[PDB]
Structure 1
Amino acid sequence: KVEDPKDFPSELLSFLSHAVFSNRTLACFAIYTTKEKAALLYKKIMEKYSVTFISRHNSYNHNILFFLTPHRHRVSAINNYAQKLCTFSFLICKGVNKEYLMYSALTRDPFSVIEESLPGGLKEHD
């Protein structure tokens, strides 16, 4: 009933690349989508991209997925994969420029960890 988000929460924008059409490849990504779709994508992305790390977070009654990949990918490729699997009410997929700061913000108010593939993520490792 509320209009879907058109971007990530304002407080996270500095950490992201907004050049969604770029040919540049990255190894850290974030997805903003619904709670149900993020739960599904957590598992699918983990396997598809053989993630180094993935976490799922509460964000304003929606969810954010955050992940690191062992190989580099274009943001559009990640976006295309999400769309191959599901229809979405909304889906925002962006590269992450500031990996540690993004993950750290996602663990603290107003965000919180739902699940992650390594306890404590980037706060505790590498």
Structure 2
Amino acid sequence: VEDPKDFPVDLHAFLSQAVFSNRTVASFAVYTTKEKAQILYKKLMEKYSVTFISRHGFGGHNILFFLTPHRHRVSAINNYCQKLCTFSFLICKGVNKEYLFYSALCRQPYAVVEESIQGGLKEHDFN
């Protein structure tokens, strides 16, 4: 109805728009509701054994950002997430700039809510 159809525009810079790609990657984002995100935060951590995952607020919606040990098609992460949704929207894309995306999601108009690693994510954990 008035559900979003993509991520907020300030994050497009960070996201891959080719959702049907055969290329397998290791960082992902999910834009959905507080409720759905609260659950996926725990499910994803267990299904993908994420090396890291965080949940961020934006009005009433949430954005999950997570890294995985092994690579996966964006298509696959999405399919898994969508099975938890019926009427709630949910957008899932691949993330290119890991530490920068995570940065933007830690500042206005966004904010961190919960993380799987204290202090969160440090810049030196990347190239």
Identity %: 81
Assess, with a 3 A threshold, how the Cα gap between structure 1 residues 116 and 8 changes in structure 2: closer, same or farther. Answer: same
Residue 101 (1) aligns with residue 100 (2): yes
Give the TM-score normalised by the residue count of structure 2: 0.93
Q: Aligned pairs, how many? A: 125
> Given residue 109 of structure 2, which amino acid in structure 1 is its aligned partner?
P
The 1-side partners of 2:111 and 2:122 are apart by: 14
The 2-side partners of 1:124 and 1:24 are apart by: 25
Q: Higher mean Cα deviation, 12-21 or 112-121?
A: 112-121
| Aligned residues of 2:31 and 2:63 also touching (Cα < 8 A) | yes
Residue 21 (1) aligns with residue 20 (2): yes
Please give the per-residue CA displacement for 1:13-53, whole angstroms capped at 9, x wherever unaligned. Answer: 00000100101111000000011000000000000000010
Pairwise CA distance, 1:114 = 0.7
Please give the per-residue CA displacement for 1:79-116, whole angstroms capped at 9, x wherever unaligned. Answer: 11112334242010000011010001101111101100
Q: Which residue of 2 aligns with 1:118?
A: 117
Q: The residue matched to 2:2 in structure 1 has which SS?
A: coil
Give the TM-score normalised by the residue count of structure 1: 0.93
Pairwise CA distance, 1:120 = 2.5
* Alignment RMSD: 1.4
Please give the per-residue CA displacement for 1:55-96, whole angstroms capped at 9, x wherever unaligned. Answer: 000013200000000000000100111123342420100000
Equivalent residues in 2 for 1:18-97, closer than 5 Å? 18-97=17-96
> Given residue 80 of structure 1, which amino acid in structure 2 is its aligned partner?
N
